Curated annotation (Swiss-Prot), chains A, B, C, D, E, F:
The modification N6,N6-dimethyllysine is found at residue 7. Interacts with MARK1, MARK2, MARK3 and MARK4. Interacts with PSMC2 through SQSTM1. Interacts with SQSTM1 when polyubiquitinated. Interacts with FKBP4. Binds to CSNK1D. Interacts with SGK1. Interacts with PIN1. Interacts with LRRK2. Interacts with LRP1, leading to endocytosis; this interaction is reduced in the presence of LRPAP1/RAP. Promotes microtubule assembly and stability, and might be involved in the establishment and maintenance of neuronal polarity. The C-terminus binds axonal microtubules while the N-terminus binds neural plasma membrane components, suggesting that tau functions as a linker protein between both. Axonal polarity is predetermined by TAU/MAPT localization (in the neuronal cell) in the domain of the cell body defined by the centrosome. The short isoforms allow plasticity of the cytoskeleton whereas the longer isoforms may preferentially play a role in its stabilization. It comes from Homo sapiens. This is Microtubule-associated protein tau. The modification Phosphoserine is found at residues 1, 20, 48, 52. It is found in: Cytoplasm, Cytosol; Cell membrane; Cytoplasm, Cytoskeleton; Cell projection, Axon.
Length: 75, 75, 75, 75, 75, 75
């Protein structure tokens, strides 16, 4: 006679922690900002940010992938 | 006789934490901003952001994918 | 005789936390903003944002996907 | 006997394509213009054109002339 | 007997293509212009053009002249 | 007897292509221009052109001339 017991057990973690996590920003101070522009001429696309204390987080990553195959064949 | 017990157990975790999490911004102070523009000429698309204490979080990622296949074949 | 017990158990978790979560912004101060424009000329699309203390969260991601296939074949 | 068959055949084409024909001006951007004049002294005819985007077609020519003669003389 | 069969045939093409034909001006950007004039003195004809983008086609030529004499003299 | 068959056949093409034909001007950007004049004294005809991107096609020529004669004389 044949007895087969198939009991794989998984308690695993797959985890990603991406970007800005758990930071403290105590009294951050942006300076005075002045932009004075005269007689400029642009022939193509202009992309402009003018600011002070600009705080930015960008996260295209951090994606988790788990693939798990279980197979049993008898005869 | 043939006895087959198929009892795989999954208690696993797949997790993503993406962008800005648990951060503390105590009294952030954006500075004064001045933009003076004269006689400018633009011949294509202009994208402009003028600000002060501009806080931005962008997350195209963080997507989790889990695939799980279970198979049993007898004779 | 043949006895087949197919009792796979899933208690797993798939979770995404994307964007801005649990952050604290205590008394944020946007600075004064001044935009002065004279004789400007634009010949294509203009996209302009003028502000102060601009808080923005954008999440195109964070999507979870779970695929689970169970198969049993006898003779 | 005398037989004269005068059957000249004309299928000729005389064609002129003068000036601007079939041109494509996709999004032409004539820049900004400023003209400032002070204490100017003139004593004869003044001809002045001021603009930003001038498309001009002048065609004193392109004329077609077709002179033809068919003289048949008998004795 | 005398037999004359005068059957000259003309399928000729005379063509002129003069000036600007079939050109593609994709996004031509004439830059910004400024003209500042003070205390100038003139004593004969003044001819002036001020612009940024000009597209000028001038065609005094391109004319066509076909001259054709058919003559048959019998005795 | 006398038989005269006069069958000259003309399929000639006379073609002129003068000036600018089939050119592609992809994104030509004329630079910015400034003209400053003070106390100038003129005493004869003044001709002035000011611009940033001037496309000029001038065609006094390109004209076609086709002179032809078909003379048949019998006795």
């Amino acid at each position: 006679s044949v007895q087969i017991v198939y009991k794989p057990v998984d308690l695993s973690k797959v985890t990603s922690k991406c970007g800005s996590l758990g930071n403290i920003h105590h009294k951050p101070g942006g300076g005075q900002v002045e932009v004075k522009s005269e007689k400029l001429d642009f022939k193509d696309r202009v992309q402009s940010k003018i600011g002070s204390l600009d705080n930015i987080t960008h996260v295209p990553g951090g994606g988790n992938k788990k693939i798990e195959t279980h197979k049993l064949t008898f005869r």
